[PDB]
């Protein structure tokens, strides 16, 4: 899939010029038509500041005024139907309006918007144009794109191209080349940050601190996160540290995460005060790092949801998950650890033995007086620590036990074991 | 170390205004004075485009023009003279003159310049100001900064802060706030790129095929790198995959890396054609990704050179190197693998036995079943694979062998073994890319 993303300011102020790109030429006020003609994207995203808004009735008449004039402009130079328009929250004191709030809301808002548009299946070829952007909006859009594509690159091949045309200079320009300023194959970067303290999801920008403590207390999201924060951190660590059984057992509820993000999003939006006479927008809540982490966490869950196999969790199924999820020395460590359990299962199968509901330590034949569950042993053994895992072999009539044993040998954490592993992985994620 | 980096365009066109930052207030045409007062950096770096220069009699006069104009502007505003000015190669056809070449040259140039500025010892607090920047030079500067800080973060704590001012509207603007638009604890990110083909170090932008072929053919770098490539990729893979013995055995020659980067940088600068009459700069060579990889590779070697020691490698030394280079599950696996060899040495010591020049497979007691060296066993066992490593125990009189064995037990790759590990690690680095 080919995706095109452009950063736009006040598109109406741009002058007609001609652009050169990929053995093609084009005349008009923006690069988008020639970019679309050479690149041939399957989808186009335009990121705009809402600070080009003029009619201050309230929030919906602002996003409307901007979307009207943008859709006007896309018709004017024929940018086609396959378009999404992200109206990001800008800030500043302009000729027709005043916009106050955290600068960083534009990052979290664009991050959130892109997380709903970027395909979570198949390979991604991403094309980014920085020609026309506000400095800060273009930079936060670039960062938001790279953060999400890094997560996408966990499961899929991801290539990223950035463009910037020659500088338009009004009195001397004849034509502007579209220069490739970046070409990069995107490195797989799993989410590597804990969920923060319940202060850093929504933050008061210009809200009295007594009013904040009130609304924070009313958010069901923060109370639900209280329970699940450690379980969600355990899942993040599963991808980062190569713990395939924990990846399955802690796989997050995509529906629940959607609902957490939506409530934080509509709470932020609801705290935007518009003064039609003063022509002033004040975003009294700011998004915190915690909103970003939830958006990245939901995106990673969507990217990897295909790997959530039906129970029970056989060695064969854990190999299949591991082979998709892990790379380099992490994959090879995980395969060696599963192989040790598999070789034991084969030995058992050959003797017509099928242990059910047996601690992994008893399955492998361990000596007594080492029942302490250490970070070292959880992290060094792909989370398959001998004191926290229960093995079951579903009895069968073996013909080729070396082929069969992997399918009939199932692993899970004991209820006590899972809590110990959660504490260890959560802690290891925080120390980082 | 507190480092302030600012991305600037045409500083002479900026209007006087007022800035708010960290409770302080400032009148003037630039953020820089108030940024310095509040942040109190140990050093300031200014990144701006060549395309400000108005003197085409030489390439070096063009740079001294831009430098002198910046120096004068710093006196005009309250700003300190403790600064590095990176005059990046910009592109565009302007009234005062013309500049042609690869747009991406600015990235490779700034990356190279920053690699020689950013300290390679101690923690780093980096502050980046994009308020005054061109978009493309800001993006390429931001990228180069993050690429190097990611490598620095392997050995040291690195914090990154980014700033941008409220937008400037000509007569409406009274006071522009300077906004923090990023606060990042930089993740350790070792080089994970192989060295590319010999097409991708220097490329012709505007140069006859034969003259390029002559320049390419003159480069000592490309000849040497042909033979050295695999050993350098083995070293890159040692940091990425958690192979502490290979890190020590393949530690690159910093002097030779410096020689390669300087030669490529001198050839690039020597190919800049400055036509004095018609006010044109043409950069006839373009940097390739290979130049970037070498700059990142030398920066990583400088960052980690403190861990290198002389040839006998003890298990104790491998533990301390590992505790500095590696984290998470990679670190815990390396410690378990070293521990297995240590526990065996402790058993040997308690028996009063001190094997020398013994294959690790013989030291550990292995079945004659598998002598083949697999990617699986090299990468899963921290590169301490039983068929490629040799152990030597230095005879001593044990009293507490559990605490003593690690210092007296040494590991080496066999000459054959090392070449097998180099192949697997090089291939694994290329395959992971
Ligand atoms: N069809 C179009 N119509 C109108 N604008 C277009 C169009 N196509 C592309 N653009 C670009 O889109 C941004 C619209 O504002 C501009 O991009 P950017 O070049 O990044 O503008 C930034 C300013 O260029 C200025 N500076 C003018 N001289 C030079 C110069 N010779 N060396 C480096 N910078 C220069 C800088 O001074 P500072 O730092 O105050 O602000 C920058 C335009 O060049
Ligand atoms: N002391 C200073 N003197 C002169 N400039 C200063 C100073 N301090 C900071 N700056 C900033 O430096 C850049 C160049 O002057 C400016 O920021 P940049 O992000 O480069 O803004 C460029 C243009 O602002 C325009 N646009 C003005 N309204 C709005 C608006 N309300 N919605 C979105 N964009 C707006 C954009 O339209 P477009 O795409 O044609 O080009 C941009 C200035 O805000
Ligand atoms: N606490 C522990 N100490 C030593 N080895 C362990 C421990 N927990 C798990 N393992 C080893 O991890 C592998 C996957 O379960 C398995 O292979 P093993 O070496 O037979 O013992 C296990
Ligand atoms: N080819 C191999 N097959 C199985 N285990 C290996 C191999 N090569 C090395 N190891 C194991 O890696 C550890 C550090 O050298 C050491 O602990 P072990 O389990 O005694 O066997 C070694």
Q: Tokens 């002389």 map to which residue?
A: B310
Give CA–CA dist A202/A289, Å, rounded: 9
Secondary structure of residue A25 in the 3-state scheme: strand
Secondary structure of residue B28 in the 3-state scheme: strand
Question: What's the gap in Å between B340 CA and the centre of ligand 4?
Answer: 8
**Quick one: which H or E segment has residue A359?**
strand A358-359
Give CA–CA dist A374/A161, Å, rounded: 44
Among the listed residues A41, A187, A28, the one whose alpha carbon sits nearest the alpha carbon of residue A119:
A41
Nearest chain B CA: its distance from A135 CA (Å): 6
Among the listed residues A418, A424, A419, A396, the one whose alpha carbon sits nearest the alpha carbon of residue A408:
A396
Task: Give every CB contact of residue B91 below 8 A, 6+ residues apart in sequence.
Answer: A166, A167, A177, A179, B51, B99, B100, B101, B103
Minimum-distance ligand 1 atom for the alpha carbon of B13? 40
* Contact (CB<8Å) A139/B136: no
Take residue B314 and report the two structure tokens written for it. Answer: 């003890």
**Resolution stated for this PDB structure, in Å:** 2.0
How many beta-carbon pairs under 8 angstroms link A with B? 160
Beta pairing, strands B43-49 & B2-8 = parallel
Handedness of CA A299, A7, B34, B90 (dihedral sign): positive
Among the listed residues A177, A142, A21, A181, the one whose alpha carbon sits nearest the alpha carbon of residue B104:
A181
Quickly list H helices, B87-175.
Answer: 105-115, 135-152
Domain boundaries, chain B: 2-185, 202-306, 313-432
Contact A318, A245 (CB under 8 A): yes
Secondary structure of residue B92 in the 3-state scheme: strand
CATH class of B2-185: alpha beta
Question: Which residues from chain B sit within 8 angstroms of residue A102, using beta carbons?
Answer: 179
Q: Tokens 């509820």 map to which residue?
A: A253
Give CA–CA dist A387/B306, Å, rounded: 39
Long-range contacts from A162-165, C-beta under 8 angstroms, 24+ separation: A162/A128, A162/A129, A162/A130, A162/B139, A163/A21, A163/A31, A163/A35, A163/A127, A163/A128, A163/A129, A163/A130, A163/A131, A164/A129, A164/A130, A164/A131, A164/B103, A164/B135, A164/B136, A164/B139, A165/A19, A165/A31, A165/A131
Give CA–CA dist A49/A251, Å, rounded: 36
A102: left (phi over 0), alpha (psi -120 to 50) or beta: beta
Query: Does B370 contact A at CB distance below 8 Å?
Result: no
Contact B107, B114 (CB under 8 A): no
> What does the DSSP 8-state code read for residue A167?
P
Taking CA atoms, what residue in A is nearest to B239? A329
Question: Which residues from chain B sit within 8 angstroms of residue A6, using beta carbons?
Answer: none
Give CA–CA dist A80/B393, Å, rounded: 73
Minimum-distance ligand 4 atom for the alpha carbon of B384? 15
**Quick one: which H or E segment has residue A289?**
helix A289-304
Question: Is A311 exposed, middle or buried, given 0-12, 13-18 or 19+ CB atoms closer than 10 A?
Answer: exposed
Q: Tokens 């995959």 map to which residue?
A: B241
Strand order in the sheet with B409-413: B313-314, B409-413, B389-393, B358-359
* Contact (CB<8Å) B241/A95: no
Give CA–CA dist B239/B241, Å, rounded: 6
Contact B97, B56 (CB under 8 A): yes
* Contact (CB<8Å) A172/B93: yes
Peptide bond into B28 cis (omega under 30): no
Question: What's the gap in Å between B168 CA and the centre of ligand 2?
Answer: 6
CB-ligand 3 contact for A371 (6 Å cutoff) = no
Question: Is B22 exposed, middle or buried, given 0-12, 13-18 or 19+ CB atoms closer than 10 A?
Answer: exposed
Interface of B with A in 112-131 (CB under 8 A): 130-131
* Contact (CB<8Å) B138/A140: no
Query: Does B25 contact A at CB distance below 8 Å?
Result: no
Contact B138, A135 (CB under 8 A): yes
Q: How many C-beta atoms surround the C-beta of residue A309 within 10 A?
A: 15
Minimum-distance ligand 4 atom for the alpha carbon of B338? 14
Beta bridge partners, B280, equal B98, B275
Task: Give every CB contact of residue A354 below 8 A, 6+ residues apart in sequence.
Answer: A348, A393, A394, A395, A396, A408
Give CA–CA dist B133/B88, Å, rounded: 13
Could you give the maximum distance between any two Cα atoms of chain B, in Å? Answer: 88
* Contact (CB<8Å) A181/B130: no
Instruction: Tell me phi and psi for residue B189, to 5 degrees.
Output: -140, 90
Task: Give every CB contact of residue A266 below 8 A, 6+ residues apart in sequence.
Answer: none
Contact A35, A127 (CB under 8 A): yes
Beta pairing, strands B409-413 & B313-314 = antiparallel
């Amino acid at each position: 899939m080919k995706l095109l993303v452009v950063s736009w300011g006040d598109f109406e102020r741009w002058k007609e010029t001609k652009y050169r790109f990929g053995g093609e030429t084009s005349v008009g006020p923006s690069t988008l038509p020639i970019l679309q003609k050479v690149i041939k994207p399957d989808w186009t995203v335009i990121v705009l500041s809402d600070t080009i808004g003029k009619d201050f009735s309230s929030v919906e008449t602002l996003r409307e005024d901007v979307r009207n004039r943008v859709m006007d402009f896309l018709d004017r130079i024929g940018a086609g139907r396959e378009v999404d328009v992200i109206i990001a929250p800008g800030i500043g004191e302009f000729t027709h309006g005043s916009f106050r709030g955290s600068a960083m809301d534009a990052y979290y808002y664009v991050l959130h918007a892109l997380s709903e548009i970027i395909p979570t299946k198949g390979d991604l070829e991403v094309h980014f144009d920085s020609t026309h952007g506000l400095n800060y909006v273009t930079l936060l859009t670039y960062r938001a794109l790279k953060d999400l594509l890094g997560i996408a690159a966990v499961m899929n091949t991801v290539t990223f191209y950035a463009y910037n045309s020659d500088p338009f200079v009004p009195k001397i320009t004849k034509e502007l080349n579209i220069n490739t300023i970046e070409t990069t194959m995107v490195k797989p970067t799993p989410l590597s940050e804990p969920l923060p303290g319940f202060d850093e999801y929504l933050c008061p920008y210009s809200m009295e601190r007594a009013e904040f403590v009130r609304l924070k207390g009313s958010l069901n999201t923060l109370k639900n996160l209280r329970k699940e924060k450690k379980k969600l951190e355990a899942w993040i660590g599963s991808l980062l540290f190569g713990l395939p059984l924990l990846f399955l057992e802690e796989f997050p509820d995509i529906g629940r995460l959607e609902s957490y993000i939506e409530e934080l999003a509509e709470t932020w939006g609801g705290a935007i005060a518009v003064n039609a006479e003063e022509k002033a927008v004040t975003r009294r809540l700011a998004f915190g790092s915690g909103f970003g982490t939830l958006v990245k966490l939901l995106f990673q869950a969507r990217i990897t949801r295909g790997l959530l196999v039906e129970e029970p969790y056989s060695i064969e199924k854990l190999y299949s998950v591991s082979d998709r999820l892990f790379r380099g020395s992490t994959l090879q460590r995980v395969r060696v650890e599963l192989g040790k359990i598999e070789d034991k299962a084969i030995k058992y199968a050959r003797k017509g033995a099928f242990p059910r509901d047996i601690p992994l330590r008893d399955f492998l034949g361990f000596d007594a007086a080492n029942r302490e569950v250490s970070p070292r042993n959880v992290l060094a053994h792909a989370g398959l620590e001998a004191n926290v895992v229960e093995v079951s072999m579903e009895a069968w009539e073996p013909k080729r036990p070396e082929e069969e044993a992997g399918r009939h040998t199932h692993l899970k954490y004991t209820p006590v074991g899972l809590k110990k592993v959660e504490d260890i992985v959560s802690r290891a994620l925080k120390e980082s």
